[PDB]
Design a protein around this ligand. Structure first.
Ligand SMILES: *CCC(=O)N(Cc1cc(C)no1)c1nc(-c2ccccc2)cs1
Ligand SMILES: *CCC(=O)N(Cc1cc(C)no1)c1nc(-c2ccccc2)cs1
Lengths: 244, 244
């Protein structure tokens, strides 16, 4: 398969030298191959066809210089040729939509853009629920997190039911679908397919997202993801480079 | 004193009827007189000179009809004559700056807009620290929390230093200053004034904000706040209306 978004780049760890300046006409993304938050920014970079370079960070063996890019020391981080630094996944995405030509991913109408960010707040419990699920050390907690996923998914299902469209922003794919897609991409890999059983609109939305040229171009092995997760839970510095 | 921002509107609780329709040409804000998140929105409405009505909600005796305005049941909530509903304090603020004429609070530049949202993220722990401090029961935790307020304020001081500006978005007041002001406004009332004396620019920024005409128009009694606070921690249905 063709690597088209930093998929083969080995992560930089403690003791690595800081990368050189960003070439003019290019925007660098500090990312990690399996990070869903960094995936929002990679999805936007492709959807808008922006020329970019990807530097992967080893999140379980962080380079000291990475804290100079983001004091929070989290991915994604964007760095342009001017040395301007933008972090936080939703800030990176909005910035890209605003600063670069190509398909406009966010509506200009202030109310419609406000609906997209309100939908994102309705989604906000899903990443914490994913965090709890992966860490569950008992069959009981595990089964109860599955019912909890149904309750959150239903709230997303209602948005589609009211808007009467396939995607969260309308007839065509927009910013909001790309911002929430990274967690839904892994439901099969997490054995959470059953949690979309009573949400038909969300099930149809998932199939439509998997057909999108941007979404499809970034899909990787579920086994690479699962192997990464095992190593990540173990606090391994080999997690981020799993499968390379 | 002249009440220009919902200071004299008795809060609506269980058993009260929801307000009438929003007059055309006006916008309604569902608020609470001492809520720092809804105060963000009230500051923006005043600064941009927007015609608006303030409806106060009794947060310790919440009408079930209010969950139809915001499913999270939180203030602020904006409601217009078209029936559109906007919630989440930073969402209501950006919406108002984009939809209405008057003073522009957000900068035109995409990167400078990004910076404002990044500074908002650096400030993000302060509301939770304020919540913990007001619930303190021992001397050790009270001292420990002051050390944490100091460290977070140092992060804000670094911004004003690196920028070489009086305000967070430049040499003039902008969106970012109004978004964070509601917590600094209460430091004297919480006896936390000493937590900013190791951050010279922060202390000067607070003095400058105090002088701002928009800030001064929304100023309330330090004792009304403290009295509201005691009742609020007791979950009293009379908290929201203290002073009225
Ligand atoms: C870029 C983010 C990332 O790679 N992380 C860090 C993170 C995010 C959250 C919610 N917690 O840490 C990843 N974290 C996981 C994860 C979360 C919780 C438990 C195990 C694994 C996968 S990627
Ligand atoms: C509009 C919201 C509001 O009035 N809150 C709710 C809230 C927000 C946070 C971070 N915690 O509660 C208020 N809550 C307080 C409060 C609660 C607990 C400790 C301190 C202060 C005052 S207003």
């Amino acid at each position: 398969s063709n690597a088209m978004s930093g998929e083969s780049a080995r992560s930089l760890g403690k003791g690595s030298a800081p990368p050189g300046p960003v070439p003019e006409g290019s925007i660098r993304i500090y990312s990690m191959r399996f990070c869903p938050f960094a995936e929002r920014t990679r999805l936007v970079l492709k959807a808008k066809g922006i020329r970019h370079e990807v530097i992967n960070i080893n999140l379980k063996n962080k380079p000291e210089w990475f804290f100079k890019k983001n004091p929070f020391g989290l991915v994604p981080v964007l760095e342009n040729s001017q040395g301007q630094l933008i972090y936080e996944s939703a800030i990176t995405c909005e910035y890209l939509d605003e600063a670069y030509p190509g398909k406009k991913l966010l509506p200009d109408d202030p109310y419609e853009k406000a609906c997209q960010k309100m939908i994102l707040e309705l989604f906000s419990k899903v990443p914490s629920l994913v965090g709890s699920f992966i860490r569950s050390q008992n069959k009981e907690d595990y089964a109860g997190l599955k019912e909890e996923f149904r309750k959150e998914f239903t709230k997303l299902e209602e948005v589609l039911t009211n808007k009467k469209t396939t995607f969260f922003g309308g007839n065509s794919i927009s910013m909001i679908d790309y911002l929430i897609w990274p967690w839904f991409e892994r439901l099969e890999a997490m054995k959470l397919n059953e949690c979309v059983d009573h949400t038909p609109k969300l099930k149809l939305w998932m199939a439509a997202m998997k057909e999108d040229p941007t979404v499809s171009a970034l899909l990787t092995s579920e086994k690479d993801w699962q192997g990464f997760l095992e190593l990540y839970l173990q606090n391994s510095p080999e997690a981020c480079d799993y499968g390379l």
